[PDB]
Subunit: 231 residues, 4 copies
């Protein structure tokens, strides 16, 4: 199977796989069962901001998710990514729906990696219909209002159930190296999760993977397009 | 055929295809016969710096090539790259040898493109044996002393004749867009051209191409790995 | 007197001092009588964007001023800033009103200078009530809605006549050096010029000055807070 | 008294004020008696690199000090800088000598601060004789070989005892804000500490201070130009 490290914005509690009983953010290391979670007051129809940070000094993967004029949710987990990921990775955004659904709209995405110095930075403040520096997988589309729709939306703007989609940056990223004095990365994205129902599902993740990562077959719903099973 | 825009550091005068009778820098628009050239005092065995700049306001492609404690060579050409290149491109470094030879050693390479904002930046201050964000074509290799050798060198660094090699950044670049108020790019690389002979050949280019560009058949020597013919 | 280089967004034609008979953008080199101007379709009450660029290779000062979904205005002038400005400068925004008036509201301001490398970058996407990295001169205030008001506005945002104000970045900038292979700078700001009258005045400038520059006595109205006289 | 947060590269053990019995790096919060230290294998006459990082999510101040082809020294301390520093600060480099001495040569210095976004970045890869974006205090000088000499060196290159000097970046920095979702800073500098004696003293610090900070009178030797006493 693929190797996944992810920050999940989990809109739907699957208590049977160790989700807490509320919308949450989590750090996932090679399992959909988050190593750590924090409560997340998701705001249906409001534009949110996610910031993810890691450096090779602290070896702490941290995420902050916020909306204007509201308290942030934050989660951190000590992990040595050198012992989990291959040296070269791709970075991406993933989303899913199941029997419940939501828009998984990305309005912007930036990423910076630095290895001491080699550097990579990309910034998307808009997505075009033919975004050739993105690998779109499953139901992911670009161009509609200059946004990235990770999961399927009908002609009338309604989100579809049992959908899964991902966008990976085209270039592989050197995420760690033994010869590195300091390695760091950050990602930011803005998202709009809307549900006609007051039961939205299933969420959005920022993930890092083996370069050849693809949607595991059947990874709709609670598996967020990341994992083949709930182990 | 490919679509090429390039800045050439041409170490060998091919007077039969319109080269001036001295080492020169040139701006190449879809031809190896430079639209504009300037005299270049190439310094055998010394580390040089090349800077290339363009913005959609001035629509002027400019390059400066320099060595420490020596006068710069500079060349500029008015061109609307919107009318020459496709919207999506790859960016690269190319080098060749022929009957005469030289090391085509790259010690560092950076690039920034901005479309008003979407942005791409990479910086290589060292190259690793397995540099997965580079597409190596022909004789180009990485890892030897942390450098990028565009053309063939022996175990002792001695350069071989009839060699051609290129390195393209893995991700496609959005170099222009009609809805853009301002588009800009800049590139820097440091190079070491050494020749045992007092007749070095054939040179190094920074180039921008169609995303699927490859070394044209036969394009060793004066064609610099860029062009199928001398038209 | 001070040494000024500026890009003016001139909302009010002073035909008696060589303004063309319409709102215009201009390049000012040590005089309010622009060395070059272009027609500017200023849009009362709409947020606009100004981009200013210069590099030591082309030695061309260029500016583009635009509104969403409208054609740009652009102006360029060939000037060797090495022969005009001192080596060390301050960078700033200036605005004035006279008998006629307008809001001179700055919503954002960024600047980058590079000398080949020494570098300086600042980005203001909001201004606080106590913005200690800004020198406010004359009527300029910060904090109201997180904006920079260069000229006087009432409690309800209504603009006052005979006002002049400037904001300079606190740190001096090394804009040129003889030992530099390449020097470049860029500035971006977003502005909101609103007038209850259909005769707005007098405009906004981005300027570069001697480090100790201050508002010349009397420099309200057509002198834009930049010049002691109309010579 | 001033408010100081610093990372010290302490070359001289003052066992009487709680220094460990070896050259060390430390995190100083309003005292020269480091809240945390790590062993540092200082290499007389070799160019070293120091990296300092902090973000408002982890609230961890970390430093890594390294030489090429040697193991790094690293130190971290959990501190909420929001509870220690004023909102606006200056950032600087400090060094001292006492009865024992050393060159306190800075070859380069970069700093980035970001408040979510407002940003500040400066990079010095060389210092000029008249570096107007630096406030030099005490014995600090610029221009000699393009370096920053924090403490006094004689005409013959010999370091002098009982010397103290600092360089602060001219612009105040917004290092924290209550409305900030994420605040971060990083600093990098390269240094050359040479001693003829083989008993070097006293060290170099990166520090953050109240904007009006100045060398405490008598703060030569073990006080590193930062503190008035050893409390
Ligand atoms: C009720 O179960 C289904 O729907 C939910 C909500 O979408 C998913 O989490 C889950 O994997 C299933 O597809
Ligand atoms: C004279 O013949 C060769 O001359 C140089 C030497 O490298 C090349 O430019 C050219 O294409 C030929 O191969
Ligand atoms: C009569 O003109 C006055 O008003 C205009 C525009 O306000 C200014 O340009 C001018 O200097 C005077 O102050
Ligand atoms: C021996 O004591 C003196 O010299 C050393 C190092 O120079 C300092 O630490 C100390 O403060 C005194 O000035
Ligand atoms: Ca879930
Ligand atoms: Ca040639
Ligand atoms: Ca006017
Ligand atoms: Ca000590
Ligand atoms: Mn979960
Ligand atoms: Mn040529
Ligand atoms: Mn005018
Ligand atoms: Mn100590």
């Amino acid at each position: 199977a693929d190797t996944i490290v992810a920050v999940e914005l989990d809109t739907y509690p699957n208590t049977d796989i160790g989700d807490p009983s509320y919308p949450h953010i989590g750090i996932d290391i090679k399992s959909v069962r988050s190593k750590k979670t924090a409560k997340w007051n998701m705001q249906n129809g409001k534009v949110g901001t996610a910031h993810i940070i890691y450096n090779s000094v602290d070896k702490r993967l941290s995420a902050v998710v916020s909306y204007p004029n509201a308290d942030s949710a934050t989660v951190s987990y000590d992990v040595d990514l050198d012992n989990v990921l291959p040296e070269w990775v791709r970075v991406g955004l993933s989303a899913s729906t199941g029997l419940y659904k939501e828009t998984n709209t990305i309005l912007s995405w930036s990423f910076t990696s630095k290895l001491k110095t080699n550097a990579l930075h990309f910034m998307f403040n808009q997505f075009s219909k033919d975004q050739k520096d993105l690998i779109l997988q499953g139901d992911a589309t670009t161009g509609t209002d200059g946004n990235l729709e990770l999961t399927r939306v009908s002609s009338n703007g309604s989100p579809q159930g049992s959908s899964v989609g991902r966008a990976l940056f085209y270039a592989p990223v050197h995420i760690w190296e033994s010869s590195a004095v300091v390695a760091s990365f950050e990602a930011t994205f803005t998202f709009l999760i809307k549900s006609p129902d007051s039961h939205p599902a299933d969420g959005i993740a920022f993930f890092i993977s083996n370069i050849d990562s693809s949607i595991p077959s059947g990874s709709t719903g609670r598996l967020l397009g990341l994992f083949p099973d709930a182990n």
